[PDB]
């Protein structure tokens, strides 16, 4: 299970989480994008969520299985590795001081993090062939922004565990012979 | 005077080139959270193209010379905002990063050489 379907499932789940959060906290509108734009782009002035992959851990010695093809008299060797990968989730939202109804980018980040940690979410995810570990920290960072106005860029890290498969060929034996000496 | 277009009358002396210019309209997603942009109706524009003349660098064994071009045109063209950029090609696709005195009479341009053009009469 390689990257492309991982990203597709992750964006679907993030869209569902943001649809829930919009009902919960009443944002104007939301948008989910990646932080890996191959083409020059210009960002959006809407409550946005971002994701990106940092690195990978093999987590265990490879496990090999043997499946026999009778017609061609060959063993098909399947190797499985239990991979752990790390994703960074971050959000942006600009605070308008005049509006009385206040919602923070930190609120959106906290709600998105809490959604993925619920039991029901994990039960839904399990049938998509991956699972999530515990999240331990969320941080707020302040930057100057292109309008020379301070704002926050909260972020946190998530861990997703899955399996990777490759296949190879190997010869097969069908009999045994021996010699006994003394 | 910031009235009549100065680049308009200047182009009557020096002599210019011809480029194909296309503007940005809107963008969508490709079920990967990656933006894919789309442009509309490329047309012919008269402009003067200059040099800034790249020198390369290294990261490790990788040279990566970045190609640059400077273009003067009497068009109100945008390089970047919450929307996309514009495109051109003297011989290969390019994209620019700047602005200039558009709301009066003319602007100035940039350009980074993208890979190639499609072909078939240089689409």
Q: What DSSP string runs through B61-116?
A: S---PPPB-EEEESS-----SSS---EEESSSEEE-----STTTT-EE---EE-S-
| Cross-chain CB nearest to B35 (options A11, A41, A51) | A41
CA-to-CA distance for B39 and B78, rounded, in angstroms? Answer: 14
Residue that is written with structure tokens 């992959």 in the block: A53
Query: Which residue in A11, A32, A42 is closest to B81 by CB distance?
Result: A42
Query: Among A20, A130, A147, A24, which Cα is nearest to A85's?
Result: A130
User: Which residues of A lie closer than 8 Å to B, measured between beta carbons?
Assistant: 4, 7-8, 11, 32-34, 36-45, 51
CA A152 – CA A103 distance, rounded (Å): 13
Cβ distance of B82 and A36 shorter than 8 Å: no
Non-local CB neighbours of B98 within 8 Å, separated by 6+ positions: B79, B108, B109, B110
Angle at A85 between CA A59 and CA A1, to 5 degrees: 90
Sign of dihedral through CA atoms B21, B26, B29, B34? positive
Instruction: Please compute, for residue B119, the number of CA atoms within 13 A of its CA located in the half-sphere on the CB side.
Output: 0
Q: Which residues of chain B are within 8 Å of residue A39 when distances are taken between CB atoms?
A: 34-37
Residue B20 near residue B123, CB atoms below 8 Å:
no
Contacting residues for B68 by C-beta, under 8 A, at least 6 apart: B52, B53, B54, B110, B111, B112, B113
Q: Are strands A131-132 and A155-170 parallel, antiparallel or unpaired?
A: antiparallel
Q: Which residue of A has its CA nearest to B29?
A: A33
Which candidate, B91, B83, B102, places its Cα nearest to that of B39?
B83
Tokens of A6: 């991982």
Which structural technique was applied?
Answer: cryo-EM
Interface test with A, best of B29, B31, B33, B111 (most A CBs within 10 A): B33
| Nearest residue of chain A to residue B30 (CA atoms) | A8
Contact, A84 vs A57, CB < 8 A? yes
Give A36's Cβ-side CA count (13 Å radius). Answer: 11
Closest B-chain CA to A15: B33
- Reported in sequence order, the residue ranges of A13-118 that DSSP labels E, i.e. its strands, are 31-34, 48-57, 63-69, 74-92
Provide, as residue numbers in chain B, all residues whose Cβ is less than 8 Å from the Cβ of A15: none
- The beta-carbon neighbor of B85 closest among A38, A40, A44 is A40
Minimal Cβ distance to B34: which of A38, A44, A45: A38
Residue A126: CB atoms within 10 Å: 11
| Lookup: tokens for B111 | 């350009």
């Amino acid at each position: 299970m390689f990257d492309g379907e991982l990203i597709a499932k992750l964006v679907v789940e993030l869209n569902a989480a943001m649809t829930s959060a919009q009902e919960a906290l009443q944002f104007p509108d939301f948008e989910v994008v990646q932080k890996a734009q191959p083409t020059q782009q210009g960002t959006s002035t809407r409550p946005t969520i971002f994701f990106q992959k940092l690195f990978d851990i093999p987590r265990g010695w490879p496990a090999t299985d043997w499946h026999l093809d009778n017609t061609a008299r060959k063993y098909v060797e399947i190797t499985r590795q239990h991979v752990e990968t790390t994703f960074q989730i971050s959000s942006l939202h600009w605070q308008n001081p005049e509006i009385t109804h206040v919602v923070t980018a930190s609120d959106i980040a906290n709600y998105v993090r809490a959604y993925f940690q619920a039991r029901s979410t994990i039960e839904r995810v399990k049938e998509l062939d991956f699972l999530i570990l515990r999240v331990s920290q969320i941080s707020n960072e302040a930057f100057e922004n292109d309008n020379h106005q301070f704002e926050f860029h909260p972020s946190f890290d998530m861990v997703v565990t899955y399996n990777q498969y490759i296949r190879l060929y190997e010869n097969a034996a069908y009999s045994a012979d021996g010699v006994l000496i003394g | 005077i910031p009235g009549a277009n100065l680049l308009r009358m200047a182009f009557g002396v020096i002599g210019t080139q011809i480029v194909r210019y296309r503007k940005f309209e809107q963008r969508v997603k490709n079920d990967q959270a990656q933006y894919v942009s789309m442009f509309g109706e490329p047309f012919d524009l008269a402009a003067s193209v200059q040099r800034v003349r790249r020198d390369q660098y290294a990261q490790f064994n990788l040279e990566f010379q970045r190609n640059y071009v400077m273009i003067f045109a009497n068009f109100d063209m945008v390089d970047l905002d919450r929307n996309m950029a514009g495109d051109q090609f003297l011989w290969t696709g390019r994209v620019f990063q700047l602005e200039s005195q558009g709301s009066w009479f003319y602007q100035d341009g940039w350009g980074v050489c993208l890979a190639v053009d499609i072909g078939a009469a240089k689409a």
